[PDB]
């Protein structure tokens, strides 16, 4: 019935949870990395449908496997950002 004694009544905060891989925007395209590349994101092709086509970065950087792969084939250097062949 009071709040003036130095009381800690029910008084809370807001929790949250998010992660920490990008994975550096799949240099073939101009769309988001994981909302995948503009070529792939205009493909609308077969795959498992949420995380099937998200991947890793051991350094904390990769591409699509095929983005860096296509540049590698055209040019054995990395496509744009010196990133994972993957």
């Amino acid at each position: 019935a009071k709040k003036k004694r130095f009381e800690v009544k029910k008084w809370n905060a807001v929790a949250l949870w998010a992660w920490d891989i990008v994975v550096d925007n799949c240099a073939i395209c101009r769309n988001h990395i994981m909302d995948l590349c503009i070529e792939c994101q205009a493909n609308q092709a077969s795959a498992t449908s949420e995380e099937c086509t998200v991947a890793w970065g051991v350094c904390n950087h990769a591409f699509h496997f095929h983005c860096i792969s296509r540049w590698l084939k055209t040019r054995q250097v990395c496509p744009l950002d010196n990133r994972e062949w993957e």
Binding site: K2, N12, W17
Partner: protein, 447 residues
């Protein structure tokens, strides 16, 4: 009879039909709504709806020709409201739907409300304006989720099941995961409590349990503005032990901070008042700013502000009206002329209850949020103007290309000189235009 049976008779009929259909739409929905409220707006809607449908239930008796003009001028008036941003038109109804799905609107019945909503989406199927409306009314219902004006959880849920059937698709799935998320947000607070109970940390916490998924997507809910804070020790334990459970669960989004879950904790603290007068989020935060110092100028609070103002204008206004403050100004934060005491008086029903009155106001907020829409609609307009250029002429260079792009849309607005790179990048992805070997600039067009 004849001008239908006379097949070329019909064309005059369907012409005049669609003419009246569009004109009567504008008249009895756009032209008859004059307070511009979704109350009167949506009701003029339903007026025209019933008029046209019933009129065709008559001698019209079908003749899809007649139905052709019907549906055509129907969806014409659908997306041809006077405010050309007709996406707020459903959003108007969304506001109405805000009414329509706010528990404190009125006491009504499953499909008492839901069938009115039904005919609403019945016509919303004529609407292409969704995505913005998606964002908008997802935001509103997410609020009312926060704010309690969710007239029915499961009812709204099945509603949007039916929506995604003929409406937005995965915003639906978003908010599904939202629902389950906050439900077991409570439940996982409960588990923390299930294993937070084991007295090892954690004596006399229990301050809050507001909880989501750490921003970095696109949701209808934000941790409303806030900054440094004392967040007493149990709030530490909440974020951290939740992160125990949850870093166990998920990492990358985590126990972020979000004020607008906050409410007032002013209760049997030690008060001659027997009073528990909970307050809104920054009502809570700024009353927190004024607890022990029995008076505080604009400068004393101004010491540890690192925030904005209106929090505390709501503070002093609700504190004086109820007479919970011995204040000096109800201003945005306060006069330096003005200051802060905890008054004992109260003006409402109970043991100082129903002071929980966030003003709960936006006109200035309405405009702030309207700003986000300009950036996404300009970006879409530009993606199309950009790909179309890129197919026409392959520039294509980087630098010269971006300059020429600048040349084509002199009128539009001032772009970023940088991001020129990104610009081509955006088209590189879509298989719209490729990167040539010749230069970092000066690429080639593909597809």
């Amino acid at each position: 009879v004849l001008l239908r049976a006379v097949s070329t008779g019909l064309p005059h009929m369907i012409q005049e039909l669609q003419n009246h259909i569009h004109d009567e739409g504008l008249r009895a929905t756009s032209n008859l709504t004059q307070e511009n409220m979704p109350t009167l707006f949506v009701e003029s809607v339903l007026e025209v709806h019933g008029k046209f449908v019933q009129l065709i239930n008559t001698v019209l008796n079908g003749d899809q020709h007649f139905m052709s003009a019907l549906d055509k001028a129907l969806t014409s008036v659908v997306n041809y409201r006077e405010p050309k941003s007709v996406c707020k038109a459903p959003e108007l109804l969304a506001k109405y739907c805000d009414n329509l799905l706010k528990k404190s609107a009125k006491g009504m019945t499953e499909n008492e409300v839901e069938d009115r909503l039904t005919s609403f989406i019945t016509v919303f199927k004529y609407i292409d304006d969704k995505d913005v409306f998606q964002k908008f009314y997802a935001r509103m219902l997410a609020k009312r989720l926060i704010h309690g004006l969710s007239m029915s959880m499961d009812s709204e849920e099945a509603m949007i099941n039916k929506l995604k059937q003929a409406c937005g698709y995965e915003f639906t799935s978003k908010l599904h995961r939202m629902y389950t998320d906050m439900s077991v947000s409570a439940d996982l607070n409960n588990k923390f409590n299930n294993f937070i109970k084991n007295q090892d940390t954690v004596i006399d916490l229990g301050i809050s349990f507001q909880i989501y998924v750490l921003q970095a997507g696109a949701w209808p809910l934000t941790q409303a503005p806030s900054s440094t804070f004392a967040i007493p020790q149990e709030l530490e334990k909440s974020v951290q032990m939740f992160e125990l459970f949850y870093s166990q669960h998920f990492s990358g989004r985590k126990l972020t901070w979000l004020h607008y879950l906050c409410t007032g904790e002013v209760k049997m603290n030690y008060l001659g008042k027997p009073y528990v007068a909970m307050v809104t989020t920054y009502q809570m935060a700024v009353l927190l700013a004024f607890n022990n110092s029995e008076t505080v100028s604009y400068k004393e609070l101004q010491d540890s502000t690192q925030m904005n103002e209106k929090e505390l204008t709501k503070t002093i206004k609700s504190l004086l009206d109820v007479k919970m403050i011995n204040h000096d100004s109800e201003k945005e934060d306060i006069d330096a002329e003005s200051s802060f005491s905890l008054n004992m008086n109260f003006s409402s029903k109970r043991t100082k209850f129903k002071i929980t009155t966030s003003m709960q106001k936006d006109t200035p907020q309405e405009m702030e949020q309207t700003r986000s829409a300009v950036d996404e609609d300009r970006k879409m307009y530009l993606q199309a103007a950009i790909v179309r250029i890129m197919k026409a002429r392959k520039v294509l260079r980087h630098n010269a290309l971006i300059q020429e792009v600048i040349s084509q849309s002199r009128a539009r607005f001032n772009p970023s000189i940088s991001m020129i790179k990104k610009c081509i990048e955006v088209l590189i992805d879509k298989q719209y235009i490729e990167r040539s070997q010749a230069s970092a600039d000066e690429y080639s067009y593909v597809a």
